[PDB]
A paper describes a structure:
We apply the integrated NMR/EM approach to the dodecameric 12 × 39 kDa (468 kDa) large aminopeptidase enzyme TET2 from Pyrococcus horikoshii which forms a large hollow lumen encapsulating 12 peptidase active sites. The dodecameric assembly forms a tetrahedral structure with ca. 12 Å wide openings, one on each of the four tetrahedron faces, providing access to the ca. 50 Å wide catalytic lumen. NMR and EM thus provided structural information about TET2 on very different length scales, but neither of the two techniques by themselves allowed to determine the structure at the atomic scale, owing to the lack of long-range distance information in NMR, and the inability to build a robust model from the EM map.
Nonetheless, at 4.1 Å resolution, significantly better than the average of EM maps deposited over the last years, our EM data set is insufficient for de novo structure determination, highlighting the challenges that many EM data sets encounter. In step 3, a real-space structure refinement was applied in the XPLOR-NIH software, using the full Coulombic potential map, first at 8 Å, then at 6 Å and lastly at 4.1 Å resolution, and all NMR restraints, calculating the full dodecamer. We additionally explored a refinement with phenix.real_space_refine29 to refine these structures furthermore, and obtained an even slightly higher structure accuracy. In the general case, validation may comprise consistency checks against independent NMR data that have been left out from the calculation, or correlation with the EM map. In the case of TET2, a crystal structure was available, and the refined dodecameric structure is in excellent agreement with the crystal structure and the EM map. Possibly, interactions between residues in neighboring loops (residues 127–131) found to be in proximity in the EM map might stabilize the loop conformation, leading to a reduced but still visible density at cryogenic temperatures.
Numbering used by the authors:
A (entry chain A), B (entry chain J), C (entry chain L): 1 to 353
Write the structure that this text describes.
């Protein structure tokens, strides 16, 4: 029911249901992003590492727009004899998010079987009966096979194979969205940006990097061919407005405006950009916050290290929950984010100093 | 009272009082370093990332001299309702150094208001009344404002804004200095070097890098434009001669000579350089130690990773205390350090092998 | 910038920079208080114990006005061989306030050398690496001397010698002050009172007692020669409006009005005085709080024990932080405190019952 048509409910479905580590047998997301973007951009290319490169042409400096598409997942490492799986996580995940339903196993493109991962048996002790946290060894997964032989006949093998099985639903039918955030909300901004951008006052290069959540320098490889002389990023990591907390996290997210990054673990944004975006949002009546973290590793950090020594600002689409399971967002912020970047790109020609 | 005129008491004042994260609204240190160095060097330039580049010209290999100017500081993240600030640290700091006086808030260049940060209230418990260590959440800061509105009318906003408010005083009027060490003692060597260097037997490039204490690869960006075929560094991290300790830390500092780095966490210095400097100090009767750490991240590590694969040695001006609050040094070592590098640079032409 | 001329910024400088244990070689504060007060009072005397006695003459009962001038400090107890000092505290101090800058050593009057005291090395253990609280043995101090011999040649000897090195700065240029509180804010009220008092309706005796923070009965000695038949006090000890706390401490200080003491550890104020001051502040539109503690030892307790059995009220100038390091105050309260006492003294003649 697109009362406003601000965020296309159909488009978000295509990207987010797709599996979130590319180049593997799951690589369909690559096709998806290029299947959309290419009609609005002059040319597009794929690097060796699974990165995607979209080059709109123009007159001006080279701007780099970075989003990550490496959604968290899990990896099978071996097959116990009873036909039940153990697993090893990809970096970033918290194991308390074991399951409530339906872990999906992507044997190959267009072939998925449902799986569950509920319980490593807690050890036998009385203080540990109170510690219902899972053991660190890691949790196990079930696909219902009785034996190792049956499991391999399905197609399960060792490899990075698994993901979370999200589906996109609407909460707060006034406005909010459930799982639209991690590793593709930024891309929706990018795609919406490409539709909204007509007059290229600066020659932009949209990238959608891989291996962000593990080895964030995955993004860096794309950078050198593309970046020089400016840079941007759209990644996120938040602890947002969870009740029972003090006010010191509340300003990170209140359900309002977009989030500019001044500081993270990795990156210290060149502050002229920040003050400029601050100026920009006020001129066009755009909402904005100023967010900082104590931790987290973003794409922007890898951009800062290319040989030119690039100055970088970063936007953030806020309001995540612990990024495994559900990933709430705000319809207002994402469309506002698009507006902001759209104007910044065109007005970048004056920013140069 | 410069009885010896070995270390100019006036010059050190200018650099160290200045605020220690550049590019921000505090960026005055940039002007300071170039305001001095430029009269003695042929040409000077500023990179995009806030790095400073001073290029003396000559006949020989390209030598790179690296010091950091990113003194530790703190960042406001939000504003509680009572007009009191919370904070988030920049990497490296220890929070037991909360305050004894006067945290300074650099709203903008030439505008500072004093602030205090003494106490997060310890939790209500009896073993914790004994644990007077601050909670890890982080400490809070006061500027005396009663409300959020009053605070923003001053000029306080979210951002990296704060520093420590050091001032330079003389202890052991025979010889020592109080806060002259961190993030500018190396620069004083550099500046003194530029005055002492007349005949450029090798074409040197003095850099003063930013974002060392966080994302040490901040220095790397300058490297590629400048470095090739040799490298040096002047950074420090020490646990020095604190009483009640064994002798295993005492050799790290005794109040004598300069410190050559063989090993750190990050960098393993190309040992030919080390043996050469060892040879050099003996030839000119210079004092020297040999220091190693188990931890710490220096500029030298980032130098080793540029594409040529550069060999690197590193000098250290010793005798720090836990780098937040007071930062004792030895007048003897710093002048000796200058002598050593001065001779090494000119004699580098024979080092090539 | 005395926009109001309510609190003289010059006067506070003289008292508070001075060293805060008298009779020692530091005793200059004694001269300071008498150098000011004597022009406005008929006569002044010094007792044997370092107490100061100022006797304005009049017609009425004998009123005693007590402030303490024994600011906290530290004492050297021995000299380790490496030229570094250990210390022993004076009562009241918390050792988590080790240093952030510049501990001052008063060898003698007008001779000071700066010192630092940062770190006792924490013991070697893993739960203790988390306990960054200092060991109770006590912290150590550095003055940069290499040996015991060098230290004594400076003038350092065993004795109570050390203080905190505060300096007075203005925060909240609308209104607040940094280190003006402990052991001399009360005296500024006293001095301001003496200027404001013209017509002595009761013969008052202003005292400035020593050895309050240790052996609070230090004040008592002055009492017997002076006190009989009434008594007052201006001392403080507070835990004030620190964020993250409940409301149960907030009324102790909110940045408003002065603080009357009903109860402490030591003293239970004769409540007729309290109700009278309550009545008084309402008649002249003066602001007031009512504050009580669970702990702390004030001058008033010692007054209650003189042979007559004196009834005593006590005023408090609020808003301290943990009294070692910074000592915030409110310009409004201190001037209001002066007004209150000024009127109470003259109207004491009706209070007698
Ligand atoms: Zn991570
Ligand atoms: Zn992420
Ligand atoms: Zn570090
Ligand atoms: Zn450092
Ligand atoms: Zn006490
Ligand atoms: Zn006290």
């Amino acid at each position: 029911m697109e009362v406003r048509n601000m965020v296309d409910y159909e488009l978000l479905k295509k990207v987010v249901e797709a599996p979130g580590v590319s180049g593997y047998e799951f690589l369909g997301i690559r096709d998806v992003v290029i299947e959309e973007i290419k009609d609005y951009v002059d040319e597009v290319k794929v690097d060796k590492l699974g990165n995607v490169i979209a080059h709109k042409k123009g007159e001006g400096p080279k701007v780099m727009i970075a989003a990550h598409m490496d959604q968290i997942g899990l990896m099978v490492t071996h097959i116990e004899k009873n036909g039940f799986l153990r697993v090893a996580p990809i970096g970033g995940v918290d194991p308390k998010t074991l399951i409530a339903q339906r872990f999906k196993v992507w044997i190959d493109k267009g072939k998925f079987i449902y799986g569950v991962g509920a319980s490593v048996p807690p050890h036998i002790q009385k203080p540990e009966d109170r510690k219902k946290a899972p053991d660190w060894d890691q949790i196990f997964i079930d696909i219902g096979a009785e034996s190792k032989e049956e499991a391999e006949d399905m197609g399960v093998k060792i490899g990075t194979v698994i993901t979370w099985d999200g589906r996109l639903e609407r909460l707060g039918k006034h406005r909010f969205v459930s799982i639209a955030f991690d590793d593709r909300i930024a891309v929706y901004t990018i795609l919406e940006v490409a539709k909204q951008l007509k007059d290229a006052k600066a020659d932009v290069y949209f990238v959608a990097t891989v291996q962000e959540e593990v080895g964030l320098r995955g993004a860096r490889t794309s950078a050198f061919g593309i970046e020089p002389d400016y840079g941007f990023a759209i990644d996120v990591t938040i602890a947002a407005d969870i009740p029972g907390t003090p006010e010191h996290k509340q300003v990170t997210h209140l359900g309002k405006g977009t989030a500019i990054k001044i500081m993270d673990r990795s990156v210290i944004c060149h502050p002229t950009i920040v003050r400029w975006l601050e100026e920009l949002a006020k001129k066009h009546e755009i909402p904005y916050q100023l967010e900082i973290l104590l931790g987290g590793g973003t794409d922007a950090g890898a951009i800062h290290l290319t040989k030119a020594g690039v100055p970088t600002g970063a936007l953030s689409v806020p309001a995540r929950y612990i990024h495994s399971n559900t990933e709430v967002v705000d319809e207002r912020d994402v469309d506002a984010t698009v507006e902001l970047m759209t104007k910044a790109l065109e007005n970048i020609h004056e920013l140069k100093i």
